[PDB]
Amino acid sequence: IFNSLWFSLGAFMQQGCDISPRSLSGRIVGGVWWFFTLIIISSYTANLA
Amino acid sequence: IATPKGSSLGTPVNLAVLKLSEQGVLDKLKNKWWYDKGECGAKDSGSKEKTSALS
């Protein structure tokens, strides 16, 4: 629970993770939060400009 | 502009209005009582639109 907390920070913007729970729901929904947070930084770049 | 029927006043008024409309005397007063007496300038308020941060 403390090991993969960094890999959520490793899924925070960038830096592709080394530990990958290959294809189950943790892989997909771990990409869903990952999909969500990349909108926020593109919007951050769009708003600051 | 309305005068009663058969009144001789209307024809000099008919020469009056067609003169004042030709000189833009109406248009200057239309600028007055709509825009200069208006509480906004529609392009002055159009020159005031500057917004900010994302909700």
Swiss-Prot record, chain A:
Non-spanning membrane segments, not crossing the bilayer: 1-14, 15-17
Gene: Gria2
Transmembrane segments: 24-44
Tissue occurrence: Detected in forebrain. Detected in dendrites of neuronal cells. Expressed in the pyramidal cell layers of CA1 and CA3 and in the granule cell layer of the dentate gyrus.
Induction of expression: Down-regulated in the pyramidal cell layer of CA1 in the hippocampus by global ischemia.
Lipidated positions per record (S-palmitoyl cysteine): C17
Free-text note on domains in this protein's UniProt record: The M4 transmembrane segment mediates tetramerization and is required for cell surface expression.
Topological domains annotated Cytoplasmic: 18-23
Note: The postsynaptic actions of L-glutamate are mediated by a variety of receptors that are named according to their selective agonists. This receptor binds AMPA (quisqualate) > L-glutamate > kainate.
Protein name: Glutamate receptor 2
Biological function: Ionotropic glutamate receptor that functions as a ligand-gated cation channel, gated by L-glutamate and glutamatergic agonists such as alpha-amino-3-hydroxy-5-methyl-4-isoxazolepropionic acid (AMPA), quisqualic acid, and kainic acid. L-glutamate acts as an excitatory neurotransmitter at many synapses in the central nervous system and plays an important role in fast excitatory synaptic transmission.
